[PDB]
């Protein structure tokens, strides 16, 4: 097709937030109840070391009389996200060797802000993108979005080759989850719910360059071919995973039946992607365990889960394990820095069996329940 | 290319505010104010006689003791936004005489809901469009989606085109801006400023359905054929035209200097237009009274700006005034109901001179600022 990603760039916020972090908040603003200790239980159990944020649990935004408003979110959004956005989205057309006026498309996504002009007004301007730029910032989605914007721009590409024409997308990916803590802490206790989303989420911001290869030289050096990708939504599964706007922000919505889902769609997804392409693949990349897994952490049931539908190890999907423990969920932006840190050394040397693949098959999980997979080919 | 429109179907709601019913809410929520008083003078003058609401003045959720939350608002979004999308949706498809299941993908757009999963979601499940559809939510662009919508629907048709495979898009605007009613009157009251939102701003669904061509019913008739398109970004009027999230919805941004961008845009954004197809149109279409206009009518002086800048009559935007008159300006959503309504015969009773033009140049602005147009090719 002709698709390649050419960079890739990730930047994390300042702060590496322990289990404590919730803990201290949850003491200051709320009495100790069932549904809070429960939550404060799970915060453990996650396997979650270290999670990425844009402050410490001292921030004046999470430490006011009520949750910040989510006007007070965006405020935080547009001063502590956008330059993540900015610096991720340089580091990957750096490795792309491009220039600002070489970028045809801009295809962004978050699910932690609204507002209009949309952010990814403000990291074009910041990068100095032409005037004429082609943007589609994506909503909805939540975390599937990684995957969801490469997929639409590998569709946008493909307009530029059927016209002849040169295409470089920048892909982006930008969440600020930590700031709704105040939001989520209200709700357990007023609810008495367990909600679990304080326990997983975290700030991130990932980019990756998608070219068409038009107006490139032949030999041109690639980090990944994009040869497929599948989308499908799971059935009557709204319910299950969302992000309700709210005075306060987003509340999530995240029940038990999304591991038991995920699991059940994995096999049946793998199969029409491994199907459509089986062809212009080796025999030695014809099953499950012959690849190299970049999946979404969208929790450790996702993982473990993965390597029990799909007879796979730990090490299959070891950049996922190293972003989750490291770093946290970082909804729709963690997906590009599994795809990051996968082609790293320190994970090479991590392979199973001393296995680099030259095939993997990204995965990610959203509302929807959306779930979007591809295939690429690892230079 | 080989795009074009197969189908259009726009759906309003069933009600009417006439310009008492901004004067009516006013005096049940506020106590007279200068700043009240100026807006609903200005209300007289706007140049619409009736705006279309999903409700009447006495409607529960705009008679609270407090403006509804964004919360609130979300929710008769989906109970009374999303069935207007449903039959604007259903219309176009049959206008197109398409299945649910030739549908390939959905651009979408709103500025007036977020939620996950998107509204998108809940109508492509009630027209019972396929699992495996390709949907695209736009975020960030207000009045401009009409038009971005309908140009990253033709990129993804192009991406099909490129693999050799028929492509229907379900392209659809929906917009609910009345329910925001209180929390304009309470930012007019509030902070003593002469916001003039509440006397222009409508509800609407509509959609077109945009096809490659390729495995069309041969000899396939179109509405329109899509010939070209452009789209800048204003710099440096970001200040200028908005809507900020805020625990009320969205308050509106808006600048004197808007009316004075938008039309000194016409003259360069055409240009540029026409010189990408010049090449393609007859003689007899070069100049701006050559075409017919599908302007988004975002106010009246937006309309009598295009008339002077460009040197049109009244008559050369017949359907425009028509929309937005009787209607008022229903962003994003105005755009397709303004197409819509182009290519009816009483519409055609009003041409300029009689001459009912082969070639349209569809045309909006919003939030960035954002400029959009297209050319179009009337059968």
Same mark, same amino acid.
Not at 57 to 70: M, Q
Not at 326 to 350: P, W
């Given at each position: 097709?002709?698709?390649?990603?050419?960079?890739?760039?990730?930047?994390?916020?300042?702060?590496?937030?322990?289990?404590?972090?919730?803990?201290?908040?949850?003491?200051?603003?709320?009495?100790?109840?069932?549904?809070?200790?429960?939550?404060?239980?799970?915060?453990?159990?996650?396997?979650?070391?270290?999670?990425?944020?844009?402050?410490?649990?001292?921030?004046?935004?999470?430490?006011?009389?009520?949750?910040?408003?989510?006007?007070?979110? @965006?405020?935080?959004?547009?001063?502590?996200?956008?330059?993540?956005? $900015?610096?991720?989205?340089?580091?990957?057309?750096?490795?792309?060797?491009?220039?600002?006026?070489?970028?045809?498309?801009?295809?962004?996504?978050?699910?932690?802000?609204?507002?209009?002009?949309?952010?990814? @007004?403000?990291?074009?301007?910041?990068?100095?993108?032409?005037? #004429?730029?082609?943007?589609?910032?994506? @909503?909805?989605?939540?975390?599937?979005?990684?995957?969801?914007?490469?997929?639409?721009?590998?569709?946008?590409?493909?307009? @530029?080759?059927?016209?002849?024409?040169?295409? #470089?997308?920048? $892909?982006?990916?930008?969440?600020?989850?930590?700031?709704? $803590? #105040?939001?989520?802490?209200?709700?357990?206790?007023?609810?008495?719910?367990?909600?679990?989303?304080?326990?997983?989420?975290?700030?991130?911001?990932?980019?990756?360059?998608?070219?068409?290869?038009?107006?490139?030289?032949?030999?041109?050096?690639?980090?990944?071919?994009?040869?497929?990708?599948?989308?499908?939504?799971?059935?009557?599964?709204?319910?299950?995973?969302?992000?309700?706007?709210?005075?306060?922000?987003?509340?999530?919505?995240?029940?038990?039946?999304?591991?038991?889902?995920?699991?059940?769609?994995?096999?049946?997804?793998?199969?029409?992607?491994?199907?459509?392409?089986?062809?212009?693949?080796?025999?030695?990349?014809?099953?499950?365990?012959?690849?190299?897994?970049?999946?979404?952490?969208?929790?450790?049931?996702?993982?473990?889960?993965?390597?029990?539908?799909?007879?796979?190890?730990?090490?299959?999907? #070891?950049?996922?394990?190293?972003?989750?423990?490291?770093?946290?969920?970082?909804?729709?932006?963690?997906?590009?820095?599994?795809?990051?840190?996968?082609?790293?050394?320190?994970?090479?040397?991590?392979?199973?069996?001393?296995?680099?693949?030259?095939?993997?098959?990204?995965?990610?999980?959203?509302?929807?329940?959306?779930?979007?997979?591809?295939?690429?080919?690892?230079?």
């Amino acid at each position: 097709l002709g698709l390649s990603i050419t960079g890739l760039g990730v930047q994390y916020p300042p702060y590496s937030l322990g289990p404590d972090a919730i803990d201290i908040l949850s003491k200051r603003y709320h009495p100790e109840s069932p549904a809070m200790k429960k939550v404060l239980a799970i915060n453990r159990y996650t396997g979650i070391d270290q999670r990425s944020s844009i402050g410490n649990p001292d921030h004046p935004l999470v430490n006011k009389p009520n949750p910040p408003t989510v006007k007070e979110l @965006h405020e935080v959004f547009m001063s502590d996200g956008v330059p993540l956005a $900015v610096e991720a989205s340089r580091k990957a057309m750096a490795e792309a060797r491009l220039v600002p006026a070489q970028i045809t498309h801009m295809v962004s996504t978050t699910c932690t802000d609204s507002a209009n002009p949309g952010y990814d @007004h403000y990291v074009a301007k910041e990068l100095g993108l032409s005037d #004429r730029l082609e943007k589609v910032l994506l @909503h909805g989605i939540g975390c599937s979005g990684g995957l969801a914007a490469l997929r639409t721009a590998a569709n946008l590409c493909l307009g @530029h080759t059927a016209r002849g024409k040169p295409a #470089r997308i920048l $892909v982006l990916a930008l969440e600020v989850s930590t700031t709704m $803590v #105040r939001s989520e802490l209200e709700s357990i206790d007023a609810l008495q719910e367990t909600r679990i989303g304080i326990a997983l989420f975290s700030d991130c911001a990932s980019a990756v360059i998608l070219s068409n290869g038009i107006g490139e030289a032949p030999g041109k050096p690639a980090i990944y071919d994009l040869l497929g990708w599948e989308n499908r939504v799971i059935p009557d599964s709204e319910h299950d995973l969302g992000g309700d706007v709210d005075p306060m922000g987003w509340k999530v919505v995240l029940s038990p039946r999304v591991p038991v889902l995920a699991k059940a769609s994995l096999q049946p997804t793998y199969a029409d992607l491994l199907s459509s392409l089986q062809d212009q693949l080796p025999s030695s990349y014809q099953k499950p365990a012959d690849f190299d897994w970049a999946m979404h952490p969208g929790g450790a049931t996702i993982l473990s889960g993965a390597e029990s539908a799909m007879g796979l190890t730990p090490e299959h999907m #070891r950049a996922s394990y190293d972003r989750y423990i490291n770093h946290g969920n970082s909804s729709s932006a963690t997906i590009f820095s599994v795809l990051n840190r996968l082609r790293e050394k320190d994970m090479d040397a991590l392979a199973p069996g001393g296995k680099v693949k030259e095939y993997v098959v990204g995965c990610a999980f959203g509302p929807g329940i959306n779930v979007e997979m591809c295939m690429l080919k690892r230079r």
